[PDB]
Amino acid sequence: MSLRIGVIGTGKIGKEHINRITNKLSGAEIVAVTSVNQEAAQKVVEQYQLNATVYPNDDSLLADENVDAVLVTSWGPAHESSVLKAIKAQKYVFCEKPLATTAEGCMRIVEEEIKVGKRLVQVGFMRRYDSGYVQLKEALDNHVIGEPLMIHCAHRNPTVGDNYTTDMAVVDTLVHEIDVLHWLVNDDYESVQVIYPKKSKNALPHLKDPQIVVIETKGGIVINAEIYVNCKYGYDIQCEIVGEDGIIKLPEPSSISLRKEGRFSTDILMDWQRRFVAAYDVEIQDFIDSIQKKGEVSGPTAWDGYIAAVTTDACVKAQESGEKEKVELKEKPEFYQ
Amino acid sequence: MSLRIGVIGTGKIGKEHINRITNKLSGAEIVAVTSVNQEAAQKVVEQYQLNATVYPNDDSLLADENVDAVLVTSWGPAHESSVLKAIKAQKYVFCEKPLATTAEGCMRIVEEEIKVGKRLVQVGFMRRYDSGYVQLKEALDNHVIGEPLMIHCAHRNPTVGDNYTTDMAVVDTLVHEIDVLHWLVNDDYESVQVIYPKKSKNALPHLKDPQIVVIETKGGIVINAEIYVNCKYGYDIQCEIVGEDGIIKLPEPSSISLRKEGRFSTDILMDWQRRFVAAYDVEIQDFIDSIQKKGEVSGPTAWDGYIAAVTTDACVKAQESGEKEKVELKEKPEFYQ
Amino acid sequence: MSLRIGVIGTGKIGKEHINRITNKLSGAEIVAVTSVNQEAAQKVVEQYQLNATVYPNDDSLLADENVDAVLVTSWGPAHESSVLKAIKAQKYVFCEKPLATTAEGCMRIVEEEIKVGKRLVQVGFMRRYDSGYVQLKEALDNHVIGEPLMIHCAHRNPTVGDNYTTDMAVVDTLVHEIDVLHWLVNDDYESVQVIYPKKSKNALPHLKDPQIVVIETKGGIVINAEIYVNCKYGYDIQCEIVGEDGIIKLPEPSSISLRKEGRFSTDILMDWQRRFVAAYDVEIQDFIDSIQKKGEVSGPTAWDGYIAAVTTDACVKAQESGEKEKVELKEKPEFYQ
Amino acid sequence: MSLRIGVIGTGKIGKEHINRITNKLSGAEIVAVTSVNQEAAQKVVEQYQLNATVYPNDDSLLADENVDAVLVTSWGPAHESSVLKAIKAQKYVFCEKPLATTAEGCMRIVEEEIKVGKRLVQVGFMRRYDSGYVQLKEALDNHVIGEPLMIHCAHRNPTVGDNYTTDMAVVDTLVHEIDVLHWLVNDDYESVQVIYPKKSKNALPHLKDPQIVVIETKGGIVINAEIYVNCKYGYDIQCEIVGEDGIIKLPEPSSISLRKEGRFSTDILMDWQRRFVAAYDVEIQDFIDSIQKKGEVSGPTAWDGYIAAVTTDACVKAQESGEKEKVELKEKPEFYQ
C-alpha cells in the first residue's frame, strides 16, 4: 500500500513536491502537512484536494502513527531541527538543501542517524538522478577513461536579482557541483582556492561575478569550477572529466536543431528550474521505491550533506581570504559506505 | 479518485502497461483484467499484487460498472472487436497498434465513436509524446521555418529475426513515421512510391531491405523515408523537415561524449524498446489526465488509426507494384478536428 | 622549371585562375592569353603584371611552342572547340565546366584523347579535391561501412537571380553532385526521376524550386538529391552515404561555435564561391604537379565530363516528363581506367 | 619578381620550409643556404634542385647582395645570433621558435629592430594564421561576446618520448597558447600559477604530467590552461573564451562523421604536425606577400617573442615554486603597436 507522507513546510518547494507526489508519481500519498502559517497549510490541502490532517507543528505531525515518512521543505535554517526530530521518531526523511546551516549541524544529524542503525535521511541533491550524470558515473565505474585526473566544469545563469550575494555563488549554486563531483569520482575534497576574473558588466556592484573555484581532492584530482551567474546567454551546466586514457563530457539538454539565417543552432535553456525537471521526479520516486522495497533510503546521505557543508564553508572562507583553504573532513563512517 | 482501468490482453505489452500504471504513473489503478489464457491473467494479478477481478472475456469486463476505461493490448487482429465493444459500453479505450487490421475496420470504429459524440479512443502512437517531436511540432506551429516543403527521415534497426517480412517494414515499422508526419505538418497523404536499393548482406534472402518510401501529401510536401532494419550499427530515428526559410531536425537521444583512441563519439542506442521509454509513460499519463480533467481523451485518435491503415495499405501495394499508388482517404470529419 | 600556361578566355573565371597561378600556387607561369575581346586580354596582362603574349585566338596561342598547357575558361559553349584544338596540339588542358554542351561533344573529345594515348584533359569538378570528399572516399575505399546502398544529399543556396531557370538546377547545380557521387562509390548511373514538392515562396514564378532528383546506379545504389536554390538560410552542401554496416557523412565547413542569447550555434556560409575555395587551389596545383611529375593529368577526366553530360541530359528530360528516364552511357574505355 | 630567400639551418624544419617555398607557395625562391654541416646543406640543394649558393656561415650568406630575406631554422640556442645579424644587415627575417633562449636575448633583438625603424622580424607562432583562431579573433574584434572574462584551454598530446621534461610542457608546448591568447584578447600577462593533478600512468616517472597553468592578465582575464602530453587518445587543442554576454569556442579539425557499431563519431588527429599544416603555409606566404607589398613583415613580432620568453620563464619558475609568480613585462614600445 501507499507510503504515507507528511510535509513540513508548505511554501513553493513543498507545494511542488505535494503536486509531484499527488499527480505525477506512484506509490505515495500526502496524509499530513504542517506550516508556520497554519492558514497556508490548510489552503494547500484544499488546493490539492488532499485527504490530509493539518498539524500546528512538526512534533505533532511526527507523532502521527499513520505518517511513515516526511519531506522537510521549510525555511532553510529550520531544516536541521525537523530532520533531527524525524530521526528520533525513526521515520524516513527527505530534506531539501541544506541539511543544516553548519557542518556541526550536519554532524548532529549524522550522529543520531548512526544510532538508529539504518538510512532514514535523503538529501535533495537531484543531480545524481539526472540521466547525464548517471551516464558519466557508469562510464567511470566501468573504467572507460582510466583514473580521473582533472574536472572542468561551469555553472552559468542568465542573471540574478539584487538579493544574490557573493557567498551565494558557492552556498546556493556551486553546492550542486560540490555534491555531485565527489560522488562521481569517489574522492574527498582536500583544499579550495577562489580566483576572481574581472567583474562582468552584468553583475551588480556588490556581487563578485564571475568566480573560479579550484578544488583538489585527496587523491590529487584537480577541479576547475567556473561560476558565472550573470552570463546573459542562458542557464548552462557543463562538466568534463579528463581521465588518463580518455575524456567524458555531460551532454547538452535535448533540443531540435535549426538552420536559419546563416546559423546552425540548438536551444539553450534560460530557466534554472527546467534544467533538472526530470531529476526531481526520479529522486522522489527513488525515495518512495527504496523505502517500500528496501526499508531504507538510497540517494544522497546525511554524510553527503556534511561534506557539502564543510566544503561550502571552506569555499566562502577562500572567497574572503584569497588563499588556498583546507577542507577538513571527519572520517567517513562505515555506516555511510 | 483513481481512474479504474481494465486490461484486455495480459501478454508482454499488457504487463508493461500494468507495471507502468501500478508502479510509475499517477491517478489510475488496474481493477480488472482479461486474457484468452485465464491462467496467465490470474498470474499477472498475483505478480503485480493487484486488487483486480479476472474476467473470462472482454464483454464481462466491460460490463463491470466499476471499470471506467480499458487498455486493449491483445493479439493485434483482436483489437478492433474489443475497441468496438468498449465504445458501445461508452468507456474510454487506449488501443495499442493497430486499431484494426483494415481501413474498413478502422472506419467501423470511427462511425461508432462519432455516434457517442465524444472522444473515447486513443491509439498508441507514442512518438507524438516524445520531447523531440513535441519541439518540432512547436517550431512548426510557430512558423519558425515557413511552409514545410520536404521531409527526410530514416528508421533504422540493427537486425531483425527470420520472421520479419518485407511488408512489415511498412506495417510494423514505418507506421510510426506515417502517424507522426501528417500530425507534424497537418497535411494528408496523397500518394506513395517504394524504391528498392541493392539488398544488404545483413538481410535474409526473403526480405527486401533496405527500402525507400516516397510519400507526397495533398499540399505538395514530399517525404523521403528510408527504412533499413538490418543496418547493424544501431537503432536510429532521424527526421529533418525542410521549410521555405529554414530547416529543423530531431535530436539524437541524450548521451555523454567520449574522446578515446583517436575518436570523439556519442552512443547510439541498440534496442528499439529504449528509444521512446519516456513517451510510453507520458502517453498513458495523458490518457489518464485527459479523462480525469476533460472527460475525453486527447492524443492520437481513431481517425489517426484510419489514416495509418489506409496509408500502410497503399505502401504495401506500392511494395508489390513498383509504381506510384494513390492514398485514398475519406474526408476528415469535424468530430476529429 | 615552370609549367608554361596559356589561358583561353579572360573573364571572371580566367582572371581568378590567373591570380591563383600567379600569386598563390607553385611551379607554373601564365605566358600566353587570348580572349574574344582582345582589349580585355591585354588589360588582364597589365593587371596581373604578366610576362605574357596576347593572341587573337586559340589556334595561334596553341601554336606557341613555349605553351605547355592551357586553361579553357571561355564562354561555356566555346569550350569544346578549344579543348579539341589543344588535344590535337598535344597539350595539356584544364577545362572549366562544361567540357561540352552535349554528350556527343564530350564523345568527340574522348575519341581524340584516346588517340593521343595519354591523359591531357582535366575537367574542373573541384569537389573531388575537397578534404571532406577526400575523407569520404578514403573511408569507402577502406570498406569502413561495407557496400554503399543509399546516398542522401542536398545542394542548397540562399537565393537565385531572375535568370536562373528550372533546367539550371541540374545543369549548373546538381552537376557537381552528379560528378562526385559516381566517383565516390565507383558505379555508373542507370536512371533518374524528378519530383517537385510544393513551390517555395522564395522562388520566382517561372522557376520550379525546390526539386528532388532520385538516381539509381547500375549496382543498385539509390541517391536522393534535394536541390533548393532559394532556401534563404545559407549555402549548404550535405552528403550522407548509408552502407551495409555504417554511415559516413560530409562535415560542415569549419566554424567557431557561439553561445549567445539562448542559442548554441555555428556559422553557415552564405556565398557559394566560398564553399570550395581550398579545392580550387588544390585542383590546379594537382594539374601542375601531375603534369610536371607524371607527364599526364589526374583528376576528373574527359570521360567524367561525358558522364556528367549524359546524366544532366537525362535529368532535364525527367524534369519535363515526370517519369523515370534512362541514363544511357557508353562503356567506359580502358583508357580511362 | 621573386623574394630571394636564404635559409640558415638545413635540418628537418629548414627542409620543410625549403619544400614549402619551392613546391607549394608563390613569389619566393631559395637562393642561398647555410648549415653547420656544409655537406648536408649541399645535399639539400641537390635534393630540392635549387639554384642556390651554399655558404659556410650566416655572415657570408647575409652579405650576399642578392639575398633579400632569411629563414632562421637552426638549433634553437643559435637563433638569436642569426636574427641579430640579419637585422644589422637590414634584411627581413622569419625565425622559428624560439626567438632567443632568454628574455634578455629577445630584448637585444627588439632594441636593434626599433633602430632600423621598420618590421624585419617575424616569429614562427603559426596559430595566429589558423582559420579557427582567425574566426575567434574576428568575433572578439566585433564585440560578439562583450569583454573577455575567462579562457579555458587545453593542449593535449598522445604520448611523449623519454627526452621530454617537465619544463618542456611550458617551453615547448604551452608557448603556443601563451603567444596566441594575449593576441586574441589584446591584454598582457601579469601572473601565473602551476597546479599538479595526480600523475598519469602514461607519464614517465621524471615527468610531471598533466599540469594546470592559471594565468591572469593585467585587465583581469583569467586563463586556465590544461597541459596533458600523455593523454593517449589524440592530439587535441581546445580553446573556449567566456565573455560577458556570450561564449566562443575553437572548432574541431574537420572530419567526416561515422555511425558504426553503436557509436556516432568523428576523428581526432594523433600527430601534432598535422594540426596546423595549413597555418604553416599561410604564415610563410604572409611573410612573402607582406614584404613584397608593404616592405615590412606582419604576423608575430620580436616583441611577441619577448612576451613569450618572459611568460615561459615565469611559468617554469611557478612549476618549481608552487606559488603565484609575477610576469614582469617592459612597456610595449609604440614601434610594435
JSON list of C-alpha atoms in Angstrom, two decimals, chain A residues 156 232-234 236 238 252 255-270, chain C residues 156 232-234 236 238 252 255-270:
[
{"chain": "A", "resi": 156, "resn": "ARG", "atom": "CA", "xyz": [26.15, 29.57, -15.58]},
{"chain": "A", "resi": 232, "resn": "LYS", "atom": "CA", "xyz": [23.12, 36.56, -20.01]},
{"chain": "A", "resi": 233, "resn": "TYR", "atom": "CA", "xyz": [23.06, 33.86, -22.73]},
{"chain": "A", "resi": 234, "resn": "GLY", "atom": "CA", "xyz": [21.36, 31.12, -20.73]},
{"chain": "A", "resi": 236, "resn": "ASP", "atom": "CA", "xyz": [24.20, 26.23, -18.62]},
{"chain": "A", "resi": 238, "resn": "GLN", "atom": "CA", "xyz": [28.93, 21.95, -18.32]},
{"chain": "A", "resi": 252, "resn": "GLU", "atom": "CA", "xyz": [23.55, 19.44, -23.64]},
{"chain": "A", "resi": 255, "resn": "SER", "atom": "CA", "xyz": [16.97, 20.25, -28.42]},
{"chain": "A", "resi": 256, "resn": "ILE", "atom": "CA", "xyz": [15.96, 20.14, -32.06]},
{"chain": "A", "resi": 257, "resn": "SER", "atom": "CA", "xyz": [18.48, 21.86, -34.32]},
{"chain": "A", "resi": 258, "resn": "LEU", "atom": "CA", "xyz": [17.71, 24.81, -36.58]},
{"chain": "A", "resi": 259, "resn": "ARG", "atom": "CA", "xyz": [19.32, 26.02, -39.79]},
{"chain": "A", "resi": 260, "resn": "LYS", "atom": "CA", "xyz": [18.12, 29.59, -40.28]},
{"chain": "A", "resi": 261, "resn": "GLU", "atom": "CA", "xyz": [19.52, 32.98, -41.29]},
{"chain": "A", "resi": 262, "resn": "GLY", "atom": "CA", "xyz": [23.11, 31.84, -41.70]},
{"chain": "A", "resi": 263, "resn": "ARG", "atom": "CA", "xyz": [23.30, 29.88, -38.44]},
{"chain": "A", "resi": 264, "resn": "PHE", "atom": "CA", "xyz": [23.05, 26.21, -37.45]},
{"chain": "A", "resi": 265, "resn": "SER", "atom": "CA", "xyz": [21.83, 26.17, -33.83]},
{"chain": "A", "resi": 266, "resn": "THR", "atom": "CA", "xyz": [20.27, 24.40, -30.86]},
{"chain": "A", "resi": 267, "resn": "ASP", "atom": "CA", "xyz": [18.42, 25.90, -27.87]},
{"chain": "A", "resi": 268, "resn": "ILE", "atom": "CA", "xyz": [19.98, 26.82, -24.55]},
{"chain": "A", "resi": 269, "resn": "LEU", "atom": "CA", "xyz": [17.61, 26.79, -21.55]},
{"chain": "A", "resi": 270, "resn": "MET", "atom": "CA", "xyz": [17.02, 30.16, -19.86]},
{"chain": "C", "resi": 156, "resn": "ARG", "atom": "CA", "xyz": [21.05, 24.43, -51.08]},
{"chain": "C", "resi": 232, "resn": "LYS", "atom": "CA", "xyz": [17.23, 31.63, -47.72]},
{"chain": "C", "resi": 233, "resn": "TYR", "atom": "CA", "xyz": [19.20, 30.34, -44.70]},
{"chain": "C", "resi": 234, "resn": "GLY", "atom": "CA", "xyz": [22.52, 29.74, -46.45]},
{"chain": "C", "resi": 236, "resn": "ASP", "atom": "CA", "xyz": [24.69, 24.27, -47.78]},
{"chain": "C", "resi": 238, "resn": "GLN", "atom": "CA", "xyz": [25.10, 17.91, -47.28]},
{"chain": "C", "resi": 252, "resn": "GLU", "atom": "CA", "xyz": [30.10, 21.22, -42.02]},
{"chain": "C", "resi": 255, "resn": "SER", "atom": "CA", "xyz": [33.29, 27.42, -37.77]},
{"chain": "C", "resi": 256, "resn": "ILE", "atom": "CA", "xyz": [33.79, 28.59, -34.21]},
{"chain": "C", "resi": 257, "resn": "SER", "atom": "CA", "xyz": [30.75, 27.95, -32.03]},
{"chain": "C", "resi": 258, "resn": "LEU", "atom": "CA", "xyz": [28.78, 30.64, -30.19]},
{"chain": "C", "resi": 259, "resn": "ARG", "atom": "CA", "xyz": [26.65, 30.52, -27.07]},
{"chain": "C", "resi": 260, "resn": "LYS", "atom": "CA", "xyz": [24.59, 33.71, -27.08]},
{"chain": "C", "resi": 261, "resn": "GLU", "atom": "CA", "xyz": [21.01, 34.82, -26.42]},
{"chain": "C", "resi": 262, "resn": "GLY", "atom": "CA", "xyz": [19.64, 31.37, -25.66]},
{"chain": "C", "resi": 263, "resn": "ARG", "atom": "CA", "xyz": [21.24, 29.62, -28.64]},
{"chain": "C", "resi": 264, "resn": "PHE", "atom": "CA", "xyz": [24.31, 27.45, -29.19]},
{"chain": "C", "resi": 265, "resn": "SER", "atom": "CA", "xyz": [25.32, 27.93, -32.84]},
{"chain": "C", "resi": 266, "resn": "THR", "atom": "CA", "xyz": [27.85, 27.70, -35.66]},
{"chain": "C", "resi": 267, "resn": "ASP", "atom": "CA", "xyz": [28.01, 29.70, -38.91]},
{"chain": "C", "resi": 268, "resn": "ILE", "atom": "CA", "xyz": [26.51, 28.65, -42.23]},
{"chain": "C", "resi": 269, "resn": "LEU", "atom": "CA", "xyz": [28.19, 30.11, -45.33]},
{"chain": "C", "resi": 270, "resn": "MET", "atom": "CA", "xyz": [26.03, 32.43, -47.45]}
]
